[PDB]
Design an enzyme around this catalytic site. Structure first.
Site, PDB file in Angstrom:
ATOM      1  CB  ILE A  28      -0.974   0.028   1.195  1.00  0.00           C
ATOM      2  CG1 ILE A  28      -0.212   0.124   2.517  1.00  0.00           C
ATOM      3  CG2 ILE A  28      -1.905  -1.173   1.145  1.00  0.00           C
ATOM      4  CD1 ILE A  28      -1.112   0.184   3.741  1.00  0.00           C
ATOM      5  N   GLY A  29       2.134   1.069   0.240  1.00  0.00           N
ATOM      6  CA  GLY A  29       3.080   2.175   0.119  1.00  0.00           C
ATOM      7  C   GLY A  29       4.435   1.605  -0.224  1.00  0.00           C
ATOM      8  CG  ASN A  30       7.758   0.737  -3.201  1.00  0.00           C
ATOM      9  OD1 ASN A  30       8.243  -0.405  -3.197  1.00  0.00           O
ATOM     10  ND2 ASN A  30       8.336   1.769  -3.838  1.00  0.00           N
ATOM     11  CG  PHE A  33       7.967   5.175   3.728  1.00  0.00           C
ATOM     12  CD1 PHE A  33       7.541   6.304   3.059  1.00  0.00           C
ATOM     13  CD2 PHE A  33       7.330   3.960   3.464  1.00  0.00           C
ATOM     14  CE1 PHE A  33       6.483   6.231   2.120  1.00  0.00           C
ATOM     15  CE2 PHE A  33       6.288   3.882   2.540  1.00  0.00           C
ATOM     16  CZ  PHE A  33       5.854   5.015   1.869  1.00  0.00           C
ATOM     17  CB  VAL A  35       7.951  -2.073   1.074  1.00  0.00           C
ATOM     18  CG1 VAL A  35       6.647  -2.654   0.597  1.00  0.00           C
ATOM     19  CG2 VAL A  35       8.893  -1.867  -0.116  1.00  0.00           C
ATOM     20  CB  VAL A  36       3.827   0.641   4.251  1.00  0.00           C
ATOM     21  CG1 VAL A  36       2.646   0.386   5.164  1.00  0.00           C
ATOM     22  CG2 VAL A  36       4.879   1.494   4.978  1.00  0.00           C
ATOM     23  CG  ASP A 141       9.585  12.586   8.532  1.00  0.00           C
ATOM     24  OD1 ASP A 141       9.214  13.586   7.858  1.00  0.00           O
ATOM     25  OD2 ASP A 141       9.864  11.491   7.993  1.00  0.00           O
TER      26      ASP A 141
HETATM   27  C1  LIG Z   1      -1.316   5.156   0.764  1.00  0.00           C
HETATM   28  O1  LIG Z   1      -1.842   5.491   2.050  1.00  0.00           O
HETATM   29  C2  LIG Z   1      -1.601   4.733   3.174  1.00  0.00           C
HETATM   30  C3  LIG Z   1      -0.544   3.818   3.288  1.00  0.00           C
HETATM   31  C4  LIG Z   1      -0.338   3.081   4.472  1.00  0.00           C
HETATM   32  C5  LIG Z   1      -1.172   3.208   5.583  1.00  0.00           C
HETATM   33  N1  LIG Z   1      -1.096   2.565   6.767  1.00  0.00           N
HETATM   34  C6  LIG Z   1      -2.169   1.939   7.243  1.00  0.00           C
HETATM   35  N2  LIG Z   1      -1.843   1.455   8.455  1.00  0.00           N
HETATM   36  C7  LIG Z   1      -0.573   1.834   8.732  1.00  0.00           C
HETATM   37  C8  LIG Z   1       0.230   1.601   9.857  1.00  0.00           C
HETATM   38  C9  LIG Z   1       1.526   2.095   9.875  1.00  0.00           C
HETATM   39  C10 LIG Z   1       1.988   2.829   8.785  1.00  0.00           C
HETATM   40  C11 LIG Z   1       3.357   3.344   8.790  1.00  0.00           C
HETATM   41  N3  LIG Z   1       4.094   3.653   9.889  1.00  0.00           N
HETATM   42  N4  LIG Z   1       5.357   4.076   9.446  1.00  0.00           N
HETATM   43  C12 LIG Z   1       5.256   3.982   8.113  1.00  0.00           C
HETATM   44  S1  LIG Z   1       6.537   4.399   7.037  1.00  0.00           S
HETATM   45  O2  LIG Z   1       4.080   3.527   7.643  1.00  0.00           O
HETATM   46  C13 LIG Z   1       1.209   3.071   7.668  1.00  0.00           C
HETATM   47  C14 LIG Z   1      -0.089   2.572   7.643  1.00  0.00           C
HETATM   48  C15 LIG Z   1      -2.198   4.145   5.416  1.00  0.00           C
HETATM   49  C16 LIG Z   1      -2.441   4.896   4.266  1.00  0.00           C
HETATM   50  C1  LIG Z   2       5.630   7.492   5.933  1.00  0.00           C
HETATM   51  C2  LIG Z   2       4.283   6.900   5.536  1.00  0.00           C
HETATM   52  C3  LIG Z   2       3.124   7.430   6.070  1.00  0.00           C
HETATM   53  C4  LIG Z   2       1.877   6.931   5.737  1.00  0.00           C
HETATM   54  C5  LIG Z   2       1.773   5.885   4.840  1.00  0.00           C
HETATM   55  C6  LIG Z   2       2.913   5.341   4.291  1.00  0.00           C
HETATM   56  C7  LIG Z   2       2.783   4.363   3.490  1.00  0.00           C
HETATM   57  N1  LIG Z   2       2.650   3.451   2.798  1.00  0.00           N
HETATM   58  C8  LIG Z   2       4.170   5.836   4.637  1.00  0.00           C
END
Ligand SMILES: COc1ccc(-n2cnc3ccc(-c4n[nH]c(=S)o4)cc32)cc1
Ligand SMILES: Cc1cccc(C#N)c1
Length: 341
Positions: A28-30, A33, A35-36, A141
């Site tokens: 859901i994120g990359n 930071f 990869v999440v 941050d």
């Molecule tokens: C694209 O939007 C989103 C991407 C990821 C998330 N997301 C959902 N639950 C989460 C728990 C923790 C984190 C997180 N902590 N540190 C980092 S870096 O990422 C992110 C989380 C929400 C919206």
């Molecule tokens: C740093 C950060 C904040 C919130 C979401 C994500 C993702 N994926 C990363």
């Protein structure tokens, strides 16, 4: 969908590894930071996020160290941590939304985020800072992307501790830190010895962004960022510099811009009043997080009849530990209302 079984150490127990099986693993994120991922824990049904962050093999992770030292409802919880292809995996509370996406939806719809949601979101950011700050941990941050929201319950969880550091009294840290728009001026002025208060500047930037519908100091380069903060606060007195970093740069003296003049004409005065006490050229002026909570602004949140715009009760706001009430313990009467005690 692949059911993955890893061997994971809990966040808050002794080092006592468990088989933990998850599924519905999506990314859901990359980014910078790492990869999440999103995942569902097989037996509980609970949703989780999993941050996969780079590790050498024998280099000691600071985020993890800090991560296990924390238990606040406005901070995302490290449920487990484990290792893979070496990479550190942090199994986290899932939280669906971020202030950045929420703020943008409004912005794009030429609409302002309801001041009440600003009250709640800021409140919980400020509590979480008062939390990590009592431990002398500066997040470093604080920005809209890093405050996560559940839009249905209004819960804010501060996240991403990949830049947080246990700030050591008498020690040097990097000055090029935080995201440009949120970076305190001391940081701009190459200060290598800054307090945790830079967070609180960063937070003031978030608050002002939530009220303006845009960042307040949107500089288009590290250097230019000063030019944006001056536009508002003015030229910092050479004194104000002494009090930021002793030592550079070259600047003429531009005039201050009055606080009510910055925000769109209808903004609550307690909101503007607050920023002035956050966006201070002086770190030692910036209200402590805990002080920031006691602020007139969050008094609607100190109402027993307070509700969410969807009829619901607010999330936990008054469950202050004495660990938290330690910056200034004589603030309970104007922090804990006469109904949650
Ligand atoms: C694209 O939007 C989103 C991407 C990821 C998330 N997301 C959902 N639950 C989460 C728990 C923790 C984190 C997180 N902590 N540190 C980092 S870096 O990422 C992110 C989380 C929400 C919206
Ligand atoms: C740093 C950060 C904040 C919130 C979401 C994500 C993702 N994926 C990363």
């Amino acid at each position: 969908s692949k059911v993955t079984t890893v061997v994971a150490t809990p966040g808050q127990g002794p080092d006592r590894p468990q088989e933990v099986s998850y599924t519905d693993t999506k990314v859901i994120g990359n980014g910078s930071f790492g990869v999440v991922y999103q995942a569902k824990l097989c037996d509980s049904g609970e949703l989780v996020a999993i941050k996969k962050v780079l590790q050498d093999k024998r280099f000691k992770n600071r985020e993890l160290q800090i991560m296990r030292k924390l238990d606040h409802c406005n901070i995302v919880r490290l449920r487990y941590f484990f290792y893979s292809s070496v990479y550190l995996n942090l199994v986290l509370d899932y939280v669906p939304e971020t202030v950045y996406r929420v703020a943008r939806h409004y912005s794009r719809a030429k609409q302002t985020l309801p001041v009440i949601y600003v009250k709640l979101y800021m409140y919980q950011l400020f509590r979480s800072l008062a939390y990590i700050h009592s431990f002398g941990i500066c997040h470093r941050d604080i920005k809209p992307q890093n405050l996560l929201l559940d839009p249905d319950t209004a819960v804010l969880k501060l996240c991403d501790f990949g830049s947080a550091k246990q700030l050591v009294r008498g020690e040097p840290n990097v000055s090029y830190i935080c995201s440009r728009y949120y970076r305190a001026p001391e940081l701009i002025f190459g200060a290598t010895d800054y307090t945790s208060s830079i967070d609180v500047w960063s937070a003031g930037c978030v608050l002002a962004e939530l009220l303006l519908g845009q960042p307040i100091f949107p500089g288009d380069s590290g250097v230019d960022q000063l030019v944006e903060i001056i536009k508002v606060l003015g030229t910092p007195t050479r004194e104000q510099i002494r009090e930021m970093n002793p030592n550079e740069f070259k600047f003429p003296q531009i005039k201050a811009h009055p606080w009510t003049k910055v925000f769109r004409p209808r903004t609550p005065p307690e909101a503007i009043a607050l920023c002035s006490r956050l966006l201070e050229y002086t770190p030692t002026a910036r209200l402590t997080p805990l002080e920031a909570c006691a602020h007139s602004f969050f008094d609607e949140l100190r109402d027993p009849n307070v509700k969410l715009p969807n009829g619901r009760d607010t999330p936990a706001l008054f469950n202050f530990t004495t660990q938290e009430l330690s910056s200034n313990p004589p603030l309970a009467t104007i922090l804990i209302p006469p109904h949650a005690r």
